[PDB]
Every structure is written in C-alpha cells, then in structure tokens.
From Swiss-Prot, chains A, B:
The gene is yacP. This is Uncharacterized protein YacP. It comes from Bacillus subtilis (strain 168). The lineage of its organism: Bacteria, Bacillati, Bacillota, Bacilli, Bacillales. It comes from the Bacteria.
Length: 174, 174
C-alpha cells in the first residue's frame, strides 16, 4: 503493498492541531504534518508521499525534510489532485494498492476512477493519533527497562524545557 | 545559591535503576546518573558536581559529558569524601550552602564538620524522580499547545522506537 498519497493542504485545514498554524503560508502546519507522516511511514512500513498545493502552502526553499517522507509541491496552475494522479500513474502496479488521503470534493479527483482508494482526513487523523500513542507507549516501556537507552531522549526533553523557560517557543502558534 | 556535591558511586549502588548497570565498571549507571544530575541542575538552578571514585567507576576518556554537570574523578589513593572536601573548600563562600549527596558511613566525611549538609541517596533519588516527572509534564503541556515545538522531540522518540525495533538496544542492561 500500500502506498499513501496525501493531500497536504486538505489535512492542514481539517486537523484541529494544524488548522490554526496559518502563519507564513501554514509553515508550522506543514512541518507538523510532515513529522506525523514520518511516524505513520515508520510504524506501518507503507510508502508515504505528501503533496502540497504550492499556491497555498509555504515552499521548503532548499530546507531538508524528514527522510521518511517524500514531500512534493505542485507546479504553478497545477492542483494537488493532478499531481496525485501523475504520482499514482508513475507508481501504478498490479501488486500495489494506491490510497489517497483527502476529504475534498471541489476538485475532479480523476484518480478515484483509476483504482485508487479514498481515505478521509478524519480517518488519517485517527490512524495518526493512535500510532503516536502506540510509539510513545513502546518507547516509555523500553526506556524504563533499559535506562541507558533513554539518555538521548531525556536530553531532547530537557532542551525543550529550557527552550520554553527562556521564551524560545513564544514565537510559535497554538 | 546552593551547590550539590554528589558521591557518584554511592548513588549508583543505592538507586534501583542504577545498581544493576554494572558492566564495564558501571559505565551505563554513570551515564544515567550524569543525565539525572543535568535535569536536577537545570530545574533547580543549583550547581551540581558529580564525584566518581576512579577505582570503582569507568573513566570518561574520550566522552565529553553533559555541559550541565561537572564530573570529577578522584586521584590514585584519594576517596570521594576527600575530593568532595577539597571542592567544598575551593567553593567555600559566605552566601553559599554546600550539600553533599551520600549515604556512606565507612569514610571519614570530615566536610560534615565544616558546615556542609548531608543529603541521603534516597532523598536525592526522591527529588530526581519528582523533577523528572515535572519536566516531562511541562514539556507535554507546551508541546500540546505549540505543536511545532514538538518536532525535534518526536524525531528523537521515533529514533528510539526504530533503534529498539532493529535490536540496537538489546546490548544495553536492565
């Protein structure tokens, strides 16, 4: 197998944790979504491609993203459904099932007449929330068992606590 | 402020999550203790110095430890209580209270007759466990509020999950 093609802008507008991170063309919402999709890819083992409409979402501009997630921006005058169709046709094979994460019905979504399955924004969110909680539980269990395996994580927790305390996270949206 | 001088080997032998990390002269126990002391220093704002008896605990060698914690190894026939006394005398000022974390009574501990206060291994552990839980709660609260502030942390959580899954944490002690 299953490849997941994600309508990035649609997820941003439908997920409560994302919809309000609108500053600088949803820059924070885009970043959070990519990290969520990195967790999804890693847990499931399914290939994940996130497609962002370049007219609505801030471009990367040489900034490197998560290696677990392929992130594609549309061309000028190209919509996410058109790019998603091109990707599904390029990766179209008998032994693989294409899934498209979108709740949008304003676009043609011609790929849904070419064997691709539609996954709603709400369904992807629930899957993401469950996977997040599962990864966290597994990590808490193994770091309790092996305390030396928690050091890199505790260092990152501590860095976040100090960033907050000195007001480094004030600039970020809620 | 207050300065905490820690009898490193004593903590290792008295704390349940440390006492069994005995491989390569308590290398893992030493590392976990340093990380716990980084959290203590950062939360309290108190200066923390960890003193390890060089004949019982594995030396740092290459390892450049946490910038939050000063780590000192004793000389050849020098015990931790002798180094702790030298440190307390070198940092002895009117506006400063010296605290020494140790439950050992085999050594002289001459510094306890020079104004320094004794903190037991159990007391330091109780303080460390409370501080750990508090930092974790504050980090969960602020990362829920500001989702973009959770990305570096989630990436470290994910790395730990993947390390476990591929058996990279099997070598570590329980």
């Amino acid at each position: 197998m299953d490849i997941l093609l994600v309508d990035g802008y649609n997820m941003i507008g439908a997920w409560p944790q994302l919809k309000d991170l609108k500053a600088n063309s949803f820059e924070e919402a885009r970043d959070v979504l990519i990290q969520k999709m990195a967790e999804y890819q890693s847990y499931t083992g399914n290939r994940v491609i996130v497609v962002f409409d370049a007219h609505l979402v801030k471009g990367l501009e040489k900034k490197q993203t998560n290696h677990r997630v392929e992130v594609i921006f549309t061309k000028e005058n190209e919509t996410a459904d058109e790019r998603i169709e091109k990707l599904a046709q390029a990766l179209n094979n008998i032994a693989t099932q294409i899934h498209v994460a979108t709740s949008d019905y304003t676009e043609q979504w011609a790929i849904f007449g070419q064997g691709a399955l539609r996954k709603s924004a709400r369904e992807l969110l629930r899957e993401v929330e469950t996977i997040e909680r599962r990864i966290e539980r597994r990590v808490r269990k193994i770091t309790s068992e092996k305390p030396a395996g928690k050091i890199a994580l505790s260092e990152e927790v501590l860095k976040t606590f100090e960033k907050w305390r000195r007001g480094d996270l004030d600039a970020a949206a809620l």
